[PDB]
Write a protein that binds this ligand. Sequence first.
Ligand SMILES: CC(C)C[C@H](CC(=O)NO)C(=O)N[C@H]1Cc2cn(c3ccccc23)CCCCCCNC1=O
Ligand SMILES: [Ca+2]
Ligand SMILES: [Ca+2]
Ligand SMILES: [Zn+2]
Ligand SMILES: [Zn+2]
Length: 166
Amino acid sequence: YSLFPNSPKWTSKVVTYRIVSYTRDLPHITVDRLVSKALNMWGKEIPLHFRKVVWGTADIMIGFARGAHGDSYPFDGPGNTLAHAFAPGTGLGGDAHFDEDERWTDGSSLGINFLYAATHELGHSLGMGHSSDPNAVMYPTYGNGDPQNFKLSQDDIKGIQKLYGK
Ligand SMILES: CC(C)C[C@H](CC(=O)NO)C(=O)N[C@H]1Cc2cn(c3ccccc23)CCCCCCNC1=O
Ligand SMILES: [Ca+2]
Ligand SMILES: [Ca+2]
Ligand SMILES: [Zn+2]
Ligand SMILES: [Zn+2]
């Protein structure tokens, strides 16, 4: 595993998150449930708790967007980069954006599995860097394992716990 330079991490006991925009590909409630699942996958391993807010600023702002969308990291259309996120910090720090040009799915159809992508992106929101282990969720490419049957690997758990304790 790897962490960001200077090991940025949240210092608060609770981290807030807000889903600012949704994808037309999935019901809103599915995205809400999948984001909660992704966050608790990492949450189960560490001393951290999350709270969803529906207005204003939240630590972790989540949204879908296509092409250029403010942050100077424009999406590229279908394929290639699927989503991206930023290390803990203020503003853009900790946020996670998903490329709306991708066909998102909960796993019951063809497309990119939103739960797998969200677990990877929120790992960055929490301070995780990319891993060299093809089995880790933090590996940089999508599709090595099974997007519909996965769990954090020992490499991922080792990293998050090094960052926040057990
Ligand atoms: C892990 C995922 C949730 C988020 C990551 C990016 C990321 O790590 N965000 O935090 C991602 O999108 N990885 C690309 C990496 C990638 C693979 N190729 C690329 C060609 C061009 C640009 C990028 C890529 C080869 C062709 C296949 C393109 C379609 C699949 N794309 C990927 O696997
Ligand atoms: Ca894309
Ligand atoms: Ca933020
Ligand atoms: Zn962005
Ligand atoms: Zn990544």
